[PDB]
């Protein structure tokens, strides 16, 4: 008996360094938006 | 007779213009005068408060009929007008705009007078005044209709008046509630219905004759009947004429079909069996007898089917509420009988069902009804669907006769063999 | 390719289902067609019934489908019917049910944008109870609208045009090609449905499970398309009616990260369309700006017109 969890956000794991730096910018860079959803940390 | 009611229901359900691709003809009294044409409200140079109201109620630019009507009415000197364009083209919005421009803000007496055939229709025209002229403080409206009882000796201070024909006459003459010589604009809205009563035509003229000569005379009618055109000339002297040919609707883009069925229970089984066959969002079903319609809708509901029922006993406002819900998607099928049977503009309708054939009295095909009924679905290239239920050889006889008039083949549909039915409209 | 690979997984997985019941369709016996007739009938109608009147009666449709799919008997026109009649029926009803949801989104939602939510919830709810049906939805949804994937089909060299238009999803016959107007809507209604399914959850049953197709796929969608060059009229249209439907749920979930994505298309992706679109098709691109110029300054994306309110659920 287990109940699985979600994947609405993506953990800080599985997240590349280019993507981490995208989510951390005050502006996105055209053509380089990360496909995976952002993490819970950087919803600002 | 039922033209006044049809106009009323058409007012309550109309949400926007009925677009038209026919060019407007202009018959200016002095042909030497160049044609008046505008393409935006800015060009007319309206009052600020007025243009404020125009943009307020959702108008971006003048409608096709308004592109020629507005300048002609605002031009100096005042030029009369007789306009002919189908219901929904923007006629009422036109003379309401014209009225509010000519009125003078500080003067507390009637300066504009409109004649509406009935009390209910008067209210609807009044509502457009209140909206477009909401940014005109101190500007009020007065309803001179039967039932608006007033005490003798009172003097009207409103800058606009709207009322039924018989009562407005009393307002100006015997009861002296209005002084006709200060009227600067005069309108007769919906002359097509106005003539349906012999009393209205005479009472309207007598009022028109008490007016000054510099008073801008305006008349509007949905239809181009001769009895109308003969009546309009008596009301508007030295007039201009604007005509817009009614949008002709076709079956170029609709696929027509029909089914042979032995009895009602087969016509019902034929219909239910179809629902699983193709994409069907919402559909209408026209029946012959009120007893059959109530039955069908009941049999439909019984199968756990959300249906809307339109019947003649219902009030006019009640018919609108069911129609409105129908457009909102509350109800997915509308089964009707003689109530709004020509064609209702509900956009999410994918199929038109003729549970019984559009029969004129005397037992002949009602081709106008058949065309408008399907003409609504599939305008400007949309694809629709039509299914005719034939329950006898006499009904079958009518079907080929309709097929004759329109020159489009109404192919046979066997409601069995699902494979064929899936191919019907996609 | 991660998407294109996943795109093929569902497609050829559906083809497997096309063949698992191969013989139920390709049967010409009298009884053989009566069965095929009564199943598709009592499985594709309840979806057509889905109205906006009340969530109270919207449960009937949900239960009638759950019983049908779970094997129970279901009252149809005339006599009751069930899947237990044929072993191939289950894998067949799941195929026809899936197509109907996209089909209802194809025709109804395209015309009536508000009906997208009362249909989605039932789909988003059936997806939970039966995940097999959901992959089948993602199958049909994807081919009929590859823009929902989202991937723009590229031109394969040396091929006729009518061959390419079909790939774009246009309905075409022997000589008739679907107009652009009566095509654009068919694609709006499809992704408006898609944009509704990802944000809505079936309220009843009190389930602790998670949304089968989470709102995460809404982020990737916007991202995946905004990183590639836009089509003239298709993108600026689809990009709008997706945000109008799901732009309120994304704003709450990915608060600041979503806003960044919006101030991008405003100043980086809008120029990417002004040149691409000719003067004869700027209709779509204009709505897209009128939509954002407000939302950006209002700090808020209006809830989609047609969202199912509390009143709809109790009533
Ligand atoms: N310029 C406009 N732009 C957009 N909508 C308009 C415009 N003018 C009128 N409408 C709307 O179109 C509908 C029909 O307007 P209306 O003036 O009543 O037309 P019709 O000539 O007037 N009807 P009828 O009086 O029965 O012959 C209403 O919902 C108006 O709000
Ligand atoms: Mg009018």
Author numbering:
A (entry chain C): 379 to 422
B (entry chain F): 54 to 479
C (entry chain B): 384 to 698
Article, verbatim:
At the cytoplasmic face of the NPC, Nxf1•Nxt1-bound mRNPs encounter the cytoplasmic filament nucleoporins Gle1, Nup42, and Nup214, which specifically activate the DEAD-box helicase DDX19 to remove Nxf1•Nxt1 from the mRNP8. DDX19 is a member of the DEAD-box helicase family, which are RNA-dependent ATPases composed of two RecA domains (referred to as DDX19NTD and DDX19CTD throughout the text). Gle1CTD plays an important organizational role by providing spatially separated binding sites for Nup42GBM and the DEAD-box helicase DDX19/scDbp5. A comprehensive structure-function analysis of DDX19 indicates that binding of Gle1CTD•Nup42GBM induces a conformational change in DDX19, thereby stimulating its ATPase activity.
To understand the structural basis for IP6-independent DDX19 activation, we determined crystal structures of human Gle1CTD•Nup42GBM in complex with DDX19 in the presence of ADP or AMP-PNP•Mg2+ at 3.6 and 3.4 Å resolution, respectively. The heterotrimeric Gle1CTD•Nup42GBM•DDX19∆N53 complex exhibited similar conformations in the presence of ADP or AMP-PNP•Mg2+, with the auto-inhibitory helix still bound between DDX19NTD and DDX19CTD. The inhibited state does not differ structurally in the presence of ADP or ATP, as the nucleotide-binding pocket readily accommodates the additional phosphate and Mg2+ ion, with minor changes in the sidechain conformations of K64 from the auto-inhibitory helix and E243 in the nucleotide binding pocket. The Gle1CTD−DDX19CTD interface involves 40 Gle1 and 35 DDX19 residues to generate an interaction interface area of almost 1300 Å2. In the structure of S. cerevisiae Gle1CTD•IP6•Dbp5∆N90(ADP), the interface between Gle1CTD and Dbp5CTD is only ~700 Å2 in surface area, compared to ~1300 Å2 for the human complex, a difference compensated for in yeast through extensive contacts made by both proteins with a bridging IP6 molecule. For a summary of differences, see Supplementary Note 4. These observed structural differences result in a dramatic reduction of the local electrostatic potential at the human Gle1CTD−DDX19CTD interface compared to the yeast Gle1CTD−DDX19CTD interface. Thus, for S. cerevisiae Dbp5 activation, the extreme negative charge of the IP6 molecule would be necessary to overcome the electrostatic repulsion generated in forming such a positively charged pocket, but for human DDX19 this requirement no longer exists. DDX19 is predominantly trapped in the auto-inhibited state, which can form in the presence of either ATP or ADP, although the ATP- and ADP-bound states could exhibit different dynamics for release of the auto-inhibitory helix. Gle1 binding facilitates release from auto-inhibition by first inducing conformational rearrangements in DDX19CTD that partially open DDX19 and generate a cleft between DDX19NTD and DDX19CTD (step 1).
